[PDB]
Design a protein around this ligand. Structure first.
Ligand SMILES: Nc1ccn([C@@H]2O[C@H](CO)[C@@H](O)C2(F)F)c(=O)n1
Ligand SMILES: Nc1ccn([C@@H]2O[C@H](CO)[C@@H](O)C2(F)F)c(=O)n1
Lengths: 226, 227
């Protein structure tokens, strides 16, 4: 097969979708074939559609999902309020495994964080990563609390030997500010910061977004992913 | 010794300090000798002082600090910004051991999450809790993101065999919305929810705060904290 990365956020409203779009855009510009998988979408009631955002921002067409829930909640809580169960473990693992192919970067975007239930019974994004032998790309803030959340996530990854492919600051403020400036340095000490995406990037059109994305990541790391 | 609890938060501004004051007040009202300890205080140049707020809200006078840093950052960055060192491990540990004594509840409030560096080198609040055989009370929100943050915290606690004393929802809205109610239900399935403190508790006066605190916790749990 090719390369499967899970993309997981240390919190909500952290830029995980725009990070998926930006890495997909950068990988496409390096001539890599890209698929993005959002097995469970939540928050549809307020208009959430992460696959469509990835489509609009990065031009990916291989966009696969299994379930969509109205409530802005973690999947198990959204499925419980909907009265309809989450997808099965086999459904999620097989979709990703069938998406995966040589020459392709497949991004699996989580919902609700690394350790919450994503598929029944009690299977998490971490479990999925083990099952498909994906490394995990961790999307973080530069704001107070990030260091704890990041160290915690990295421990959780190590605890099941899921490789960490690095950090992405999903939104970098302008001007940085005192805390954000210190955290960017501190985060670089515990893991590789692959990019810091400028605040406001989700509002860009496709050409500007691809411009931002090509410059946001190390070109050699992107090309080395596959 | 007595009972030592480290009080830690799943994130920033989840209500760690109000929970410390609320538990201190309920315990005092059950006749328990209470001390509150904040070994690392950051943000003092902005007026942050969690010990002072605890005394204000709950009337506790047995308050113990140690390190104070001006900038409102994580302890390691706040120390560096001021050209200062973090405390040593035994400086935090001795501070707690000196407070600890039979019949006493000693609450140790963290600074910026369970795994943030508290003492040099690389000593965290989890390491301190191991050294003093304290359990951890985990302060959380009812907002989206809490379930992951809480499960990460519990897993890190269990990785070093630090007992979880339960959860406290530091700010609970009135009325609770759908998301808040669903999250509290899910939180109670992963651990004991000891309390959910009403929003705006910091603006209560001494008498209202004490009454909130006595109603917020299970009487039998608070009384059983110290033998
Ligand atoms: N670099 C970034 C990161 C995030 N965002 C936007 O912030 C909201 C919260 O994640 C996202 O929903 C958002 F995507 F709209 C952004 O505009 N640019
Ligand atoms: N139950 C609660 C919880 C929190 N607060 C106030 O919110 C800020 C961050 O929790 C605290 O600083 C605050 F204390 F001001 C509150 O008033 N009542």
């Amino acid at each position: 097969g090719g390369t499967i990365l899970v993309v997981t956020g240390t919190g909500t409203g952290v830029g995980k979708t725009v990070v998926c779009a930006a890495l997909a855009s950068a990988a496409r510009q390096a001539g890599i074939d890209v698929a993005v998988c959002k097995p469970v979408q939540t928050g549809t009631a307020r208009g959430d559609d992460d696959l469509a955002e990835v489509g609009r921002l990065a031009g990916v067409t291989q966009l696969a999902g299994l379930a969509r829930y109205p409530q802005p909640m973690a999947p198990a809580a959204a499925a419980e309020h909907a009265g309809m169960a989450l997808p099965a473990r086999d459904q999620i693992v097989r979709l990703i495994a069938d998406l995966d192919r040589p020459g392709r970067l497949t991004l699996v975007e989580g919902a609700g964080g690394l350790l919450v239930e994503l598929a029944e019974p009690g299977v998490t994004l971490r479990d999925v990563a083990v099952d498909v032998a994906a490394a995990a790309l961790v999307v973080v803030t530069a704001d107070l609390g990030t260091l704890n959340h990041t160290k915690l996530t990295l421990e959780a990854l190590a605890a099941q030997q899921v490789s960490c492919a690095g950090l992405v600051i999903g939104s970098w403020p302008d001007p940085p500010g005192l805390v954000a400036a210190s955290n960017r340095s501190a985060l670089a000490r515990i893991a590789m910061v692959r990019a810091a995406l400028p605040a406001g990037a989700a509002s860009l059109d496709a050409g500007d977004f691809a411009a931002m994305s090509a410059a946001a990541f190390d070109r050699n790391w992107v090309a080395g992913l596959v």
